Amino acid sequence: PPGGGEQEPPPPPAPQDVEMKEEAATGGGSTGEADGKTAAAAAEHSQRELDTVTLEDIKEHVKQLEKAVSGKEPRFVLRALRMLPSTSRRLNHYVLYKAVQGFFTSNNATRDFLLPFLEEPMDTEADLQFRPRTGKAASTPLLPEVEAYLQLLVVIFMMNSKRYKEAQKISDDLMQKISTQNRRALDLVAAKCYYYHARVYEFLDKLDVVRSFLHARLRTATLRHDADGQATLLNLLLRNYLHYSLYDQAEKLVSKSVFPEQANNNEWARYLYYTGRIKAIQLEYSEARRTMTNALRKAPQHTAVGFKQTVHKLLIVVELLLGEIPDRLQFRQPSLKRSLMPYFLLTQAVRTGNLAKFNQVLDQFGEKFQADGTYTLIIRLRHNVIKTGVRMISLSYSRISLADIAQKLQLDSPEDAEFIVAKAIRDGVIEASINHEKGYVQSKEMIDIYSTREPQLAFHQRISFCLDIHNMSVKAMRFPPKSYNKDLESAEERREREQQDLEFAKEM
Amino acid sequence: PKNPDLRIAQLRFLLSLPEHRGDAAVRDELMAAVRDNNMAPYYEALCKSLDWQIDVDLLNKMKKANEDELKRLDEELEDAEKNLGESEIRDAMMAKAEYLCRIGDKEGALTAFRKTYDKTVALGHRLDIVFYLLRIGLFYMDNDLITRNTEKAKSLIEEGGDWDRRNRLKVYQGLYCVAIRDFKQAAELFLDTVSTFTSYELMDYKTFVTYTVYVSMIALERPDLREKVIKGAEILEVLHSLPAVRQYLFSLYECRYSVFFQSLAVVEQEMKKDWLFAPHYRYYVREMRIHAYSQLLESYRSLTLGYMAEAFGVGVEFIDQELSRFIAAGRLHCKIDKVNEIVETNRPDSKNWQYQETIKKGDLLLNRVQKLSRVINM
Amino acid sequence: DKKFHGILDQGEGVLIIFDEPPVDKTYEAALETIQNMSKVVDSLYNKAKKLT
């Protein structure tokens, strides 16, 4: 009682202070400036909404004695929020429930009491036409239920709160979404609620209802409005199709919405990865390593263990499917020590020419690659290992017996070591012939690749690219010329005085 | 006092990393550690060391004497400012804040040194403070702070000639350029070996001589070796005191290849033992091998492989797996034949390999401005 | 010692002699510009990345 009585009373006192400045000002500008004013010019309440996501992702942890998040829901649910004669008393209602929390006991939201914190959209002049108010102020109690997730009688409360959110969502899906960002703001709010929806209502439940429901939500997209539902409803379409095994990958080939048109460097950024693993499981032909690389270079300053570890893995998984390999562990941050062992230990064996060393990796960490599910792509690397071997030995030795190369490559059989090497000519990994009667394999000395018109092509790939980065550095920098607007000639009165002094010099 | 101070950190290396070697280093490291007021730098060297349970009075007597020096600085400052000389507080701790630099950590050093830097209007103390910052940044390998006071030093090497502050500085650029794997710059900073002096940090001048020959034998080609290190009397008479190193250099120049491996495992083995080399001994001799292969193999075209075992160094299959791993490594320009037992070489033109490094650096800087172009404009 | 260059044969003692002055002047002079501009962009971190 003294330690809780001194340390527990400031928590309400703090956060309520910052929460009368983040989402009270967002309550003033997001509803008063998007439901009534334009928000395409001023949509800063969406990045402010990102701030009021990132505060509350790490804001609540405890089961809330002293009613410091559990007393917010008796406070913040009595919200008409219609107009200033009805919200000027709501500003008092941000203060009266402080007297309810401190003077009295409020209602302790501990896994039982969320339902009287839910049934507010009917009473106290609460409405739904201000879905800037009811979507943000739906999500803001829809979050901290599912933020801790506290898997104990919080899945149906979450669920019914998501049902009220689905009622607001139907009012968005059918009810007057024109030019207000009623649809567009609730594609961010819909988008974020698809994740808690998808954290408690995907793996527990049957996302497959939200497959066809997601075809409805995507169906009303691209017809009426053409942004931000084009973005989220396709990765959110993808994330269990990858996880599962639907045919939508060629659906994603024939899809129109493969562009969502500058989707804000989160959905646009990760979207390239989510379509990268598509052609990974549909046989990388070096096509998507540029978009894996692009998805890596479009990612922010958050951490690597979110997904940047995974794109850092798969991105040169597929380059190991090619044959080229860079160095990977060279930035020992929050991942280039922790998650690299089996993987750098794999490519360590791949950069060698040894055959069963690959097996010495694969038995050692087959289950670890099965923990990522990459194992069905790891299994096919023996082709690339023997390409490394035949390129290595075919580059090193000139006139070598086939009765040595299977022995060095531990292939156990010269009689098809004719045939692996034979395919290695037949594809194009090596040129010259084999005296199959004798046994020696000769290789010609192919030098002067300089005059062999090729590094011109290695140039011409890059000349056009550097002209493109120059021209984009022209196109995205002509903004500056603005504000300042008058370049006066010299003056007016000094021109008149110049006429007077010139008239006196002419009179002289 | 930082003039004997490098042996301390070298013996921290010698205590820590050779795991078998853990007795005499914690003997003599203690011999210098629990005397001369060293207090801060050995708590985690004590973690790597044993418990040493009763260190408490050993701490308290030395932070007690440290408290005595601290409080007599605190007795110095007020009579210092009372009748003023050249701001005699910072004239006191421009001598005793280096005591606090050895004894205390780098912070009580650095705020007193950036403090006292604004006092001495002539560089004759400024550049020595900069040398102290160079030495402690060498100790804690402050790889960004050395880049600062190197240039900040060099800005004060202009006015005057100050070749005891320029040739002295070239030693520091040489030791950092051999800390990093920058060998052709390292011997180039180790060019002189004349104005280099009976220093505090290589108290043997001949240890500096061993260092500059070990880097020079990679860093320069035969034309230079056959003029510079072979005809230098000042470099010759000090390796005249060396039986092994004089043999080690002359085995390569005098085409004595088989004993060159014998001395090579000695020099590489000691380099494996060596602090501030030990990061790159595995890079050293893998270059020495392919360099020695270049020197012998670029004489003939039709040299067989079975000549090199008895003539060069034993082990035919070792020469097989060695050479290949180098033709396979894209260097060592030849093309070995197998089932007639001969080694054939070529000559490459300086047009494809000179192209290769250009596509390396071009793709690298394209990645660079590509990345920064992603950084700006969100 | 490279005062002379060519090759020496061991089969019968034949000195095949050959020479051309290669293009040294172009690619390395273009190359050190690249390592200048690397340091330039490293300075652009010190006026762009920290700044805005």
């Binding site: 140039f459 890059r462 000349i463 550097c466 002209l467 980065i469 120059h470 550095s473 022209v474 995205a476 920098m477 903004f479 500056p480 603005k482 504000s483 | 071009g362 800087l365 394209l366 401005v369 920064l372 172009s373 700006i376 404009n377 | 273009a30 510009t33 690249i34 501009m37 330039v40 962009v41 652009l44 006026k47 762009a48 700044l51 805005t52």
Partner: peptide, 30 residues
């Protein structure tokens, strides 16, 4: 390749010269 390679760095440096111009103009001017 070298000339086009330097040209882009030049225009990028002008973009930084533009950013510094508009930013330290928005808060100062208003």
């Amino acid at each position: 390749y070298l000339a086009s390679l330097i040209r882009s760095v030049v225009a990028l440096h002008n973009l930084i010269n533009n950013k510094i111009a508009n930013r330290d103009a928005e808060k100062k001017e208003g």
